[PDB]
Scaffold this active site. Structure first.
Site, mmCIF file in Angstrom:
data_model
loop_
_atom_site.group_PDB
_atom_site.id
_atom_site.type_symbol
_atom_site.label_atom_id
_atom_site.label_comp_id
_atom_site.label_asym_id
_atom_site.label_seq_id
_atom_site.Cartn_x
_atom_site.Cartn_y
_atom_site.Cartn_z
ATOM 1 N N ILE A 1 0.892 -1.128 0.013
ATOM 2 C CA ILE A 1 -0.101 0.100 0.024
ATOM 3 C C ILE A 1 0.945 1.355 -0.070
ATOM 4 C CG2 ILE A 1 -1.634 1.389 1.393
ATOM 5 C CD1 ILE A 1 -2.350 -1.426 2.881
ATOM 6 N N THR B 1 3.400 3.204 3.105
ATOM 7 C CA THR B 1 3.577 2.602 4.529
ATOM 8 C C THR B 1 4.813 2.053 4.596
ATOM 9 O OG1 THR B 1 2.863 0.602 3.108
ATOM 10 C CG2 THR B 1 0.875 2.156 4.226
ATOM 11 N N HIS C 1 1.028 -1.360 -7.800
ATOM 12 C CA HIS C 1 0.462 -1.340 -6.421
ATOM 13 C C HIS C 1 -1.166 -2.103 -6.495
ATOM 14 C CE1 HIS C 1 3.306 0.903 -4.034
ATOM 15 N NE2 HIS C 1 3.466 1.521 -5.076
ATOM 16 N N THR D 1 15.343 -0.568 11.399
ATOM 17 C CA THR D 1 15.578 0.406 12.149
ATOM 18 C C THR D 1 14.580 1.406 11.907
ATOM 19 O OG1 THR D 1 16.798 1.607 10.264
ATOM 20 C CG2 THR D 1 18.029 0.303 11.945
#
Ligand SMILES: O=C(O)[C@H]1O[C@@H](Oc2ccc([N+](=O)[O-])cc2)[C@H](O)[C@@H](O)[C@@H]1O[C@H]1O[C@H](CO)[C@@H](O[C@@H]2O[C@@H](C(=O)O)[C@@H](O[C@H]3O[C@H](CO)[C@@H](O[C@@H]4O[C@H](C(=O)O)[C@@H](O[C@H]5O[C@H](CO)[C@@H](O)[C@H](O)[C@H]5NS(=O)(=O)O)[C@H](O)[C@H]4O)[C@H](O)[C@H]3NS(=O)(=O)O)[C@H](O)[C@H]2OS(=O)(=O)O)[C@H](O)[C@H]1NS(=O)(=O)O
Ligand SMILES: OC[C@H]1O[C@H](O[C@H]2[C@H](O)[C@@H](O)[C@@H](O[C@H]3[C@H](O)[C@@H](O)[C@@H](O[C@H]4[C@H](O)[C@@H](O)[C@@H](O)O[C@@H]4CO)O[C@@H]3CO)O[C@@H]2CO)[C@H](O)[C@@H](O)[C@@H]1O
Ligand SMILES: Nc1ncnc2c1ncn2[C@@H]1O[C@H](COP(=O)(O)O)[C@@H](OP(=O)(O)O)[C@H]1O
Ligand SMILES: [Cl-]
Ligand SMILES: [Cl-]
Ligand SMILES: [Cl-]
Ligand code: NA
Ligand code: NA
Ligand code: NA
Ligand code: NA
Length: 670
Positions: free
Chosen positions: A397, A400, A453, A610
């Site tokens: 998506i 994100t 997508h 991270t």
């Protein structure tokens, strides 16, 4: 909102014709027009539109709604001189104070009372307990004892609270939003009494405001429960009525929630001084309040001078007696969630479709904004066989953090044969050992082979075909305000994803179905205002839309059903599809995301994930009102994300706890 004019919203049960008269005097004296309106559901519309630039200059409602509006930055702080403040009771200013600031003008104190017809019942009952006997007598005469609105929890709350029900516990100088009192013993006893009235046919679960009012005003029922506003129609019908203290339950008083009719000023109003003038110098005067009161009575007014004048009215005296016995409503944002929760519980218990215990348990969960999940929901254990026929499908998506996560999947997993990522090449070959078959369907492995997508609807309909198995769908989610801002900034620098197929029910949308927001090749340079302004912007509720089965709502054709139907279907479908995926992560929890992926699939990454706090979204300086508008445009996503976050964090805790217990049991051998 036009400058040089005032628009006022007030509820349809209040004296809006009287308020209009006050507006006409103001216009006479100033040339400034005042328009009064009473839209349906104004209290729900206000946060939806104030956040943009429609809406009224002044909004009237009981004070319980205003903390939520203030927290969203929708109200102007009001700035009354000390001289004016002393003209109103301090009790009432307290009702309209939020986080130290005054956020509206108090107008009047309202509480429910017992209203009775003196021609049927010259002495009203003092106890709820005597109502069934009384009804039996009256039914022999072709009448009933009591009818009142059972659809709005405001009206049933006095009884539920009487023996111990509460909304939020007041503790250590504040309302504890986790300590909800809707399913305690007192709440259950009150509701049980009401449900029993209905079972024994002394009241009907379907009775609403209109039905109860019609019956009382026609002399069909001896009593009703209502507020000061109702007295006008009773007088119109020429009933000989009294207003008195609510009956007691288990010897304790009924405890109505006390409301203060309050007038807020819209933070987006260009007329804040004129609104202030109107409210302080026209409405909150003996003459202004008299004009409103004569239309529909206000109850006990906040202005000391006029309150003294009316104090002798025994109807108002009874209103004060009930108010003293009840509790002032909290004004906190969580009040609307409380009310929505109790509304539903009472309807379902009253109907007999759910027991009191179950209905109130459900209200408890909802009012406290909790999510209950089964072990099965929390347990995601995949024997992932890369040698076998298993395939992970990464549904990416936009915005994100899917580039990061997708790079982790192809670069960072410890495998005997990991993905082959050649230098200066976008994609990687992610093949099973010894085979030419891919184990990962994703942008960086197979490419966008089911469309740019591709969403849940596209992937689930295309992936099985284009690979011929066990398909393990995964995704990432992000808090929607941040995700939306990120998409706005990316579009502003040239992103369009214009080549996406948006396939559903076997075709792409038509231009009519899905109009473009921009002229030309892209929407580069767009301001946040103009971004927010396009109705067909695919950024709105993107995560819900891309996780839902869009066939359930007629694909992209918005004419096939109403929003009130489509929205709950989308949200439920997105929740279900998300919950039932093998795994998902959250952008804001990179390390937990890593850990859960690893423990779900029994894989390990080479380098730790991270957390990058300094994102482009984080750098946008965002006014509260604007944030609130972005929430409103993404309200389905806000709900999905609240759900997803809680499930994800409960999954984390469950998996960590189990792992810690296992370690320990191992040590408790050695
Ligand atoms: O092969 C042919 O048919 C060839 O024939 C030639 O003529 C002849 C050849 C040989 C002979 N002979 O006798 O031997 C005779 C004649 C003819 O001259 C050619 O025209 C013809 O080529 C056609 O077919 C080929 C093969 O299919 C095509 O090449 C493929 O596609 C290319 C392409 O589409 O540009 C190219 O793909 C690579 O580059 C793409 C563009 O960058 C990549 O796709 C993009 O991916 C982006 C991304 O994931 O980042 C995505 O970006 C969007 O999303 C991200 C994430 O959210 C955002 O960050 C972005 O901002 C956002 N941008 S957006 O808003 O604008 O959307 C993009 O949308 C998406 O386009 C693609 O992944 C990448 N693939 S690669 O890594 O594998 O290289 C390649 O050359 C090739 O790809 S592939 O087939 O290998 O997979 C060629 O385009 C086509 N030409 S055409 O004129 O017929 O159309
Ligand atoms: O979707 C279900 C229903 O949702 C909507 O009603 C909601 C409101 O939006 C909430 O704010 C709340 O309503 C409270 C209200 O805030 C509180 O002040 C009190 O309302 C009294 C009011 O003080 C008094 O002046 C007079 O007008 O009577 C009102 C009660 O009718 O109590 C309300 C709760 O009963 O919760 C309700 C849901 O119950 C929407 O408006 C509905 O149309 C919709 O069906
Ligand atoms: N490890 C990480 N921690 C936090 N945010 C991250 C991240 N990796 C990527 N993101 C954010 O995810 C967004 C890109 O998502 P995508 O790859 O799906 O387009 C960017 O947001 P911003 O645009 O606000 O900077 C980026 O900063
Ligand atoms: Cl591609
Ligand atoms: Cl984390
Ligand atoms: Cl593991
Ligand atoms: Na290629
Ligand atoms: Na990017
Ligand atoms: Na353009
Ligand atoms: Na910021």
């Amino acid at each position: 909102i036009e400058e040089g004019k005032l628009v006022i919203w007030i509820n349809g049960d209040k004296g809006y014709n009287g308020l209009a008269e006050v507006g006409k005097k103001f216009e006479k004296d100033t040339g400034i027009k005042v328009t009064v309106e009473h839209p349906d559901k104004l209290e729900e519309k206000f946060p939806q539109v104030a956040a943009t630039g429609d809406g009224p200059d002044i909004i009237f409602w009981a004070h319980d709604r205003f903390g939520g509006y203030a927290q969203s930055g929708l109200l102007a702080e009001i700035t009354p001189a000390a001289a004016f403040q002393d003209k109103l009771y301090p009790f009432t200013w307290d009702a309209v104070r939020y986080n130290g600031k005054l956020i509206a003008y108090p107008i009047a104190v309202e509480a429910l009372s017992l209203i009775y017809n003196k021609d049927l019942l010259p002495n009203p009952p003092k106890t709820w307990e005597e109502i069934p006997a009384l009804d039996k007598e009256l039914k022999a005469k072709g009448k009933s004892a009591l009818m009142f609105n059972l659809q709005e929890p405001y009206f049933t709350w006095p009884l539920i609270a009487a023996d111990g029900g509460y909304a939020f516990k007041y503790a250590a100088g504040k309302y504890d939003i986790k300590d909800v009192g809707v399913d305690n013993a007192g709440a259950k006893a009150g509701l049980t009494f009401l449900v029993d009235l209905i079972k024994n046919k002394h009241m009907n679960a379907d009775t609403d405001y209109s039905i109860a009012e019609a019956a009382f005003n026609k002399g069909e029922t001896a009593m009703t429960i209502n507020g000061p506003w109702a007295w006008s129609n009773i007088d119109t019908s020429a009933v000989n009525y009294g207003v008195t203290v609510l009956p007691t339950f288990k010897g304790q008083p009924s405890k109505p929630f006390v409301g203060v009719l309050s007038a807020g000023i819209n933070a987006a109003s260009p007329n804040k001084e004129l609104a202030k003038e109107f409210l302080e110098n026209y409405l909150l005067t003996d003459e202004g309040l008299e004009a409103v009161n004569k239309d529909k009575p206000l109850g006990a007014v906040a202005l000391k001078s006029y309150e003294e004048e009316l104090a002798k009215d025994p109807r108002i005296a009874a209103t004060m007696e009930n108010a003293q016995k009840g509790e002032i409503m909290p004004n906190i944002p969580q009040m609307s969630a409380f009310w929505y929760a109790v509304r539903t519980a009472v309807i379902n218990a009253a109907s007999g479709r759910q027991t009191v215990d179950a209905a109130l348990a459900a209200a408890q969960t909802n009012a406290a904004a909790k999510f209950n999940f089964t072990e099965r929901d929390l347990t995601r254990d995949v024997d992932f066989n890369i040698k076998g026929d298993d395939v992970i499908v990464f549904l990416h998506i936009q915005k994100t953090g899917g580039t990061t996560f997708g790079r982790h999947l192809v670069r960072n997993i410890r495998l005997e044969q990991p993905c082959d990522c050649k230098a200066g090449q976008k994609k990687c070959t992610c093949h099973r050992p010894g085979k030419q078959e891919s184990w990962l369907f994703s942008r960086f492995s197979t490419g966008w082979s089911c469309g740019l997508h591709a969403d849940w609807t596209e992937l689930t309909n295309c992936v099985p075909v284009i690979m011929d198995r066990n398909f393990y769908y995964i995704t990432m989610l992000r808090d929607p305000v941040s995700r939306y801002l990120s998409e706005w900034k990316h579009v502003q620098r040239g992103a369009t994803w214009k080549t996406s197929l948006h396939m559903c029910d076997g075709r792409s949308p038509t231009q009519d179905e899905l109009p473009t927001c921009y002229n030309g090749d892209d929407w580069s340079g767009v301001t946040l205002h103009d971004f927010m302004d396009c109705p067909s912007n695919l950024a709105n509720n993107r995560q819900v839309r891309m996780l839902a089965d869009l066939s359930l709502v007629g694909c992209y054709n918005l004419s096939t059903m109403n929003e009130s139907e489509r929205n709950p279907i989308l949200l439920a479908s997105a929740k279900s599809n998300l919950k039932n995926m093998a795994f998902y992560g959250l952008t804001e929890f990179q390390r937990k995301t890593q850990y859960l992926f690893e423990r779900t699939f029994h894989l390990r990454f080479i380098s730790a994930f991270t957390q990058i706090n300094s994102t482009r979204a984080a750098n946008v300086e965002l006014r509260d009102d604007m944030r609130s508008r972005i929430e409103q445009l993404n309200m389905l996503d806000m709900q999905l994300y609240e759900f997803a976050k809680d499930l994800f964090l409960q999954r984390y805790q469950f998996v960590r706890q189990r792992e810690r217990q296992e370690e320990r049991l191992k040590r408790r051998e050695e």
